[model samples]
Target chain A: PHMKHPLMNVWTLWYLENDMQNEITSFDTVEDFWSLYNHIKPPSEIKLGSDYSLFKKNIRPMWEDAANKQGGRWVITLNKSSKTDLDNLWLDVLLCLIGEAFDHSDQICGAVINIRGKSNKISIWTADGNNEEAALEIGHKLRDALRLGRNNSLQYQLHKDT
Target chain B: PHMTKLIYERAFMKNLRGSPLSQTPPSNVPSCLLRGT
Candidate 1:
């Protein structure tokens, strides 16, 4: 029999619009991830003001979710000039999550890519905002993985504050 | 990446049910943009 690969956690992909939020699909393996990824429009192609979110299974992509109630997000904001790189950047973020690249992977909840006209954003949400060590380490790993420079420094914001 | 190694690991593979391909479509892709196109 053939074998299948599995990710550390099942992930749910969600699509959000001004008036609607829908679950795109969920995947637990590398193959499934690729299938879903290949089938969807890249973030750059999504309608403006819409959003895509990939969260661990059972975790709603909202601040009100129990896992996110005390959480915070590491944000990377990009202007129009950076539009060309949005898709690649979002893919990298997805790989990092599915790959479980962080030492504090347990602290990570998921990631979001927001589509906007002038200023887009990508953010990785963590389970705890008060856990400075875990949050900062995740931020540093994200920066290194994405090769972000000073111009696109990562910022953290608690759910309660955002 | 470790993802390659994970596909064959006994621990996870044992628990996975049914076929390897996902039964449900992950997203809403139009026919024009399906993988075969």
Candidate 2:
């Protein structure tokens, strides 16, 4: 059986610790994505203050990446009490990114999950912060993917400010 | 543009191939292991 279903884009997984960002792996197919996902520790198991980022292959996860410099992120912040939900939410974000579930998929740069001491954060980076429609639509679609409710609003912030 | 659900469904069902890293987890995983009681 030759089943090689390629994703719309190749995505690279990154790990950040102690001021260093390391590339874990790159996958272009759903099966590959799962293999990587299955082997790694979920968001909750990573060390606090560390981060796991998934970005399109050519784009680094840092704001300094040319693809991300002028962009912004749609962030979903969770308090420490919500720790149990971090891995699931992070997985949903990953699915949305590789699934091409947004109308403005081109506008998307990647996603980041920051494991913090007091709270955790997951954000979807869009290529341009100022593209109102593109940014908002991505946010809305992301909310839908995560099955978030009306009361849970996502915040969008430009990279330069963060 | 969105891919159809079935396209992704098939992809997910397929056996993994193409990446050598699939067998071994990244080296950073051990160093970043969680710490808390």
Candidate 3:
């Protein structure tokens, strides 16, 4: 029997519904994650004010997580007009994770896709901001694998500064 | 008591730096409704 190998780490998927009164921390694990994901459309299909986050297990999808406390995220913002491109880009981001495409795969914490009124966002989170060497390597690898054009640029943002 | 006020204020401000409560996003409510005529 052909069996798939276990990933470097267990990853958790989180969905951010636009329920104003619900606290962000109220989200549950894989079961609830799949439930929410199945009910909603993809980022391209969703209305603004929705988001999806995929993070490593045990690491909360927030800046406050101890693993994320000192890290920064690589943000890729897409214009509203690029709705058609959202799904592909999102898929590439996920492939990068499960494929362990980064030189320092251990540094990665997770990724997120935010659907906003103005623009959508796809971000990859790393566990350290001060580790400039590893972070930049990961960034370049991501850009190359995604085949980002010359006009497209990625931004690194430190959680502490934001 | 005069010196204590200054010291307390400084300490309070320092503690605010790392407090998660202080980091919450500000409410989007309009200021006009918050002000008394």
Candidate 4:
């Protein structure tokens, strides 16, 4: 997401459709992101178990996906009061990724947003769980960007640890 | 550039959400000066 022109990478968006199956859209620009988003119901409106995922075009969002094989996610859970802020936080998080706000964007596979009943969830999937230095820095950026409070918790879960 | 929540209501909110995000009354505005006007 360099400012000069086109982005450095092509990211695909995935969200569950009526069947709760993944519907994929390959997008390389911010316009398409907004365009796609405008046409869909947010997680708040969707049935439980549906999710939103964004990843590099070549990387499918699954544990078996090669890029995710050794990676993990930085997870955050929200309380009922935070529900109103979910879309804002989700938008900001997407902007951070597609905007290349992180110093080490390469470490990011994408993000996972589980819009379920009770509390919504957000996570940043990193491609290197063993690379604690880069992963933790990414985690720090995510927490700071999301304006997560000290009482708000952040956990790094390696794939192997899951 | 940093954007306070009010800045969003004035501009980006119109561009993003289909409905204009409603603003709080001056009485509800806190010491943070969210509604500086």
- In model 1, pairs of residues that clash are A5-B7
lDDT of 2 by residue, A7-82 (tens): 8889999888843788878888776676677777788877778899999989988897788999999988777636
Lowest summed lDDT across 10 adjacent residues in model 1 chain A is found at A17-26
Candidate order (TM-score)? 1, 2, 4, 3
The predicted structure with the larger lDDT, 1 or 2, is 1
Q: Estimate each model's TM-score.
A: 0.81, 0.80, 0.67, 0.74
lDDT of model 2 at position A72 = 98
TM-score of chain A of 4: 0.88
**Per-residue CA lDDT of candidate 4, range A70-127, in tens?**
9998888876635448877787777778767677777889888887777777888989
lDDT of 1 at A22: 76
Rank by lDDT, descending? 1, 2, 4, 3
Off by over 4 Å in 1: A81-84, B1-37
Cα lDDT of candidate 4 equals 0.66
lDDT of 3 by residue, A1-20 (tens): 32222344566656666522
Candidate scoring better on TM-score of 2 and 4: 2
Better candidate number, 3 or 4, judged by lDDT: 4
User: Which stretches of candidate 3 lie above 4 Å from their native place?
Assistant: A18-40, B1-37
